[PDB]
Design an enzyme around this catalytic site. Structure first.
Site, PDB file in Angstrom:
ATOM      1  N   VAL A  54      38.233  39.743 -21.439  1.00 50.99           N
ATOM      2  CA  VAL A  54      39.337  40.334 -22.185  1.00 50.99           C
ATOM      3  C   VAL A  54      39.337  40.098 -23.688  1.00 50.99           C
ATOM      4  CG1 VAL A  54      40.833  40.323 -20.171  1.00 50.99           C
ATOM      5  CG2 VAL A  54      40.883  38.379 -21.719  1.00 50.99           C
ATOM      6  N   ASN A  80      47.310  39.250 -17.193  1.00 52.58           N
ATOM      7  CA  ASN A  80      47.457  37.906 -16.653  1.00 52.58           C
ATOM      8  C   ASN A  80      46.415  36.878 -17.121  1.00 52.58           C
ATOM      9  OD1 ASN A  80      48.448  35.948 -14.374  1.00 52.58           O
ATOM     10  ND2 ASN A  80      46.233  36.159 -14.062  1.00 52.58           N
ATOM     11  N   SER A 132      55.315  32.805 -19.760  1.00 50.96           N
ATOM     12  CA  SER A 132      55.516  31.453 -19.242  1.00 50.96           C
ATOM     13  C   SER A 132      56.939  31.015 -19.478  1.00 50.96           C
ATOM     14  CB  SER A 132      54.605  30.482 -20.006  1.00 50.96           C
ATOM     15  OG  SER A 132      54.839  29.117 -19.655  1.00 50.96           O
ATOM     16  N   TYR A 145      48.850  27.136 -26.740  1.00 47.36           N
ATOM     17  CA  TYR A 145      49.315  27.782 -25.530  1.00 47.36           C
ATOM     18  C   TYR A 145      50.756  28.259 -25.727  1.00 47.36           C
ATOM     19  CZ  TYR A 145      50.778  28.361 -20.652  1.00 47.36           C
ATOM     20  OH  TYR A 145      51.271  28.831 -19.454  1.00 47.36           O
ATOM     21  N   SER A 148      50.948  31.171 -28.087  1.00 53.68           N
ATOM     22  CA  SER A 148      50.500  32.409 -27.465  1.00 53.68           C
ATOM     23  C   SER A 148      51.511  33.003 -26.501  1.00 53.68           C
ATOM     24  CB  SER A 148      49.146  32.196 -26.759  1.00 53.68           C
ATOM     25  OG  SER A 148      49.259  31.474 -25.538  1.00 53.68           O
ATOM     26  N   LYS A 149      52.244  32.156 -25.782  1.00 58.07           N
ATOM     27  CA  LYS A 149      53.200  32.685 -24.813  1.00 58.07           C
ATOM     28  C   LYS A 149      54.430  33.286 -25.470  1.00 58.07           C
ATOM     29  CE  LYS A 149      50.793  32.170 -21.090  1.00 58.07           C
ATOM     30  NZ  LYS A 149      50.482  33.409 -20.302  1.00 58.07           N
ATOM     31  N   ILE A 177      53.625  26.586 -11.148  1.00 53.68           N
ATOM     32  CA  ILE A 177      53.223  27.302  -9.941  1.00 53.68           C
ATOM     33  C   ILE A 177      51.984  26.619  -9.349  1.00 53.68           C
ATOM     34  CG2 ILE A 177      52.533  29.551  -8.990  1.00 53.68           C
ATOM     35  CD1 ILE A 177      55.396  29.470 -10.280  1.00 53.68           C
TER      36      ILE A 177
END
Ligand SMILES: OC[C@H]1O[C@@H](O)[C@@H](O)[C@@H](O)[C@@H]1O
Ligand SMILES: OC[C@H]1O[C@@H](O)[C@@H](O)[C@@H](O)[C@@H]1O
Ligand SMILES: OC[C@H]1O[C@@H](O)[C@@H](O)[C@@H](O)[C@@H]1O
Ligand SMILES: OC[C@H]1O[C@@H](O)[C@@H](O)[C@@H](O)[C@@H]1O
Lengths: 255, 255, 255, 255
Positions: A54, A80, A132, A145, A148-149, A177
């Site tokens: 990606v 995803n 997230s 992270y 980015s979310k 999860i």
């Protein structure tokens, strides 16, 4: 289930394992024609797969062009594919920080950019972006992270506003999860002892009001709902699948 | 005024014009030692200026070194430098999209990354990031800009969490403010006629509950507050300076 | 400080102790003419006091009418009076649940309703409502309290939109602050041992990224800022004074 | 459809018309045993109805008892009953203001309080509260209504936190939906002329990114999802069914 998803072409990125695989499998169960875009081969799976990184816009474009030519349409795109490495802004190399943004944000941008023209040629297409719970409440040493979310939420709102009412775009915001990524996160803290890993995971689960961590299929249920006509007036939002984590203040009260 | 800001070393990026300039000017009035990092010369100004491209890590690191060795400390960093161009994810070139992310997000990341090690050696340092009301309610054909502003919020929360309690980090989320960039936005819609531009700006002002657009100095007031000891228990948040824009639904009711 | 507050008439409810007293004292230090509306006498204080139960609209109206007649104007109203008792929706009596809503929400409604007509007769009046970090992240067995604090945010937005641009209305959302109410909350859990109380309070402080609970004066600083002209383009928002609590997910990461 | 909803006992308040009726009708289609609690007779309907005033605790408790003893369980409670009138905090009588809070908030509190003890005896019960997009972006001259809808969010989070993991509680936040109440709102603005009312409704629809107002069935889809096992790890949240209204800034950009 959501009957309207049957026979529709659904692209899911990073669907060889974890949440992505659960999403792909749910759409297969709904009767959709599913194609996984990832760098790893999902092995014997009921869905189709195209080797695709990606972060490479040319490979993403080529893969999507191929899917439209082979299947005749693209109705749903689920972004995803993602990664996570840890480190303070001062310790993580600039390259690794940028790499996390490249996969987690730019990957969503490229897949969306190339799929949209085809999607609008179908009736009521829908994009679902996996963000997230950390688009709201965050963890330490996760600068790239977390950044980015949050970015994913902005991209989601933008696509939703820019293409309404023809195409809808929403995000899913999961908390902890049960996935390989999460088990690995635990191992990075407690080691390989399956007993000690269950303990760390149980600790995380007890921090969620639901008293357990979530299952991949639970995130997949939210994705299927948002991708379906059952969410026909829902666009630009993030559906939190967090077992109540984002509404809990960690301050005790008398009981 | 905030007496604690006197003599403190304050770095403001993109302070040669608009909001950035109003911020630098306010800190000068507070008695701080202010340094503007920008690629443009602010010309006659009561604050110091260093030629620096925020998207060039080598230049950023060198400038921050020049400031620390010359002044002896760095107490406040205000990340403000930014840009905006319009287009749907489909029309805007990938290069222009990436550029907006580079300036609006990576510029904040580089300045923060290099200043933090120095800032934590001073007492109660603070970083203020200029985001936008569009970290919540957004505009059309502005995906890169919107994404970058949401990203800034994530960066802000992560720096706040990773460095508390020694250093605080917050953002300011302004709505429409009287700046050259906002005047360029109006021109791109109604032409170069200065009178029509005024009518357009007035239309935007009337959309804000305060019935006018904001002033650069009003954003500066918020930044000075967050940078001061008056905000000693405030970290990881965005202070909205939006004249009520983000809480207004554009739905009429009986009067 | 905020020079514009000097000589202005400021009403603060529930200002005989804790945060309310800290707010009243800060305004006195700013040179304002302060009047406390509460059921308890603040004892020897530098501010004025009128015995007033905020749940009695007639007494609230009479007290405010009296202040306007005596002082000639009302420029700022700080709604702060509040209470908290604990219990599951099934255990707390309906009367006690309603009582919490009466004080925490209706008290703010009555004071605002009767002060507003007078306030708009002054230049740039401002109302500041004390809500809670629990307008976002909440505690267990605090149904009525949590409900009332969310309600306060709605009331705040409504007043802001209904009276802009003449009058501004904002809220402050504090997390754990060192007050008699909080110490009592701790005692209800650990007893009267000053050593054990400090431990429980320290525990709460360690849950905040700032690693300590807040001080009343820190909340007061936010109130003074929002009440001042330094917040001239800020209306309808809640300024979180939470030491980063609302942006923290209680999930460990490798370090 | 959600196969798990078959044969489950579902209570819906204010289901004789509008959104409430669409919700009851959807659950009947899912095979649930549906009971409408309202003061109005829904007339010919595929679901059961009990004469009940949600603001009367004695009536609410008695109705919930009639349902549990007759059906053997209560799996889902959808609090929907509500009202709205307009006026500034200054003009609206205190009695009318309190009434809106009584119906929109206390009605939800009473039904939840009495149903919960029964619901927790069944497996995976869930409560869905109908709030509004105005729990975020609000309208003018609607303080009681806006306050009540924000209050509903707090009530929702608290029930979710106090009863997880056995029972889940979430809210649905609809924007403008085609209902009689929305048609009354238009009439109060443009008169009783049905054509002008249509023009007004169209204006509101064009303010939503989806370019139309929502349908009662679209809200019902969200409620059914949240009530189902498909939402097993979703609790304490509000699902926005707003056609993108809450993420849209009313500020034009170049096209
Ligand atoms: O709940 C917080 C969760 O955020 C997301 C992942 O990184 C995992 C983690 O457990
Ligand atoms: O108010 C929204 C504002 O967002 C920021 C800028 O881009 C400008 C715009 O007017
Ligand atoms: O931080 C949560 C805080 O919420 C508010 C008060 O009730 C106190 C508590 O410590
Ligand atoms: O979209 C805002 C909507 O909020 C809800 C109702 O009151 C109606 C209104 O149109």
């Amino acid at each position: 289930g959501f009957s309207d998803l049957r026979d529709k072409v659904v692209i899911v990125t990073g669907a060889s394992m974890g949440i992505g695989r659960a999403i792909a499998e749910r759409f297969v169960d709904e009767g959709s024609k599913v194609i996984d875009l990832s760098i790893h081969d999902p092995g014997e799976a009921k869905y189709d797969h195209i080797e695709c990184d990606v972060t490479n816009p040319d490979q993403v474009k080529a893969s999507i062009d191929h899917i439209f030519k082979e299947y005749g349409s693209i109705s749903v795109l689920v972004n995803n594919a993602g990664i996570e490495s840890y480190g303070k802004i001062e310790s993580m190399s600039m390259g690794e920080w940028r790499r996390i943004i490249d996969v987690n944000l730019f990957g969503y941008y490229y897949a969306s950019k190339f799929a949209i023209p085809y999607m609008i040629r179908s009736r009521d297409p829908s994009i679902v972006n996996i963000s997230s719970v950390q688009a709201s409440i965050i963890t330490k040493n996760a600068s790239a992270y977390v950044t980015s979310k949050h970015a994913v939420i902005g991209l989601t709102k933008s696509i939703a506003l820019d293409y309404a009412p023809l195409l809808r775009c929403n995000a899913v915001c999961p908390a902890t999860i049960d996935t390989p990524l999460v088990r690995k996160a635990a191992e990075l803290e407690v080691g390989s002892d399956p007993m000690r890993i269950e303990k760390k995971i149980s600790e995380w689960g007890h921090e969620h009001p639901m008293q357990r961590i979530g299952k991949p299929q639970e995130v997949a249920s939210a994705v299927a709902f948002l991708a379906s006509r059952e969410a026909s007036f829902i666009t630009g939002t993030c559906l939190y699948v967090d077992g109540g984590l984002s509404i809990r203040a960690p301050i005790s009260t008398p009981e």
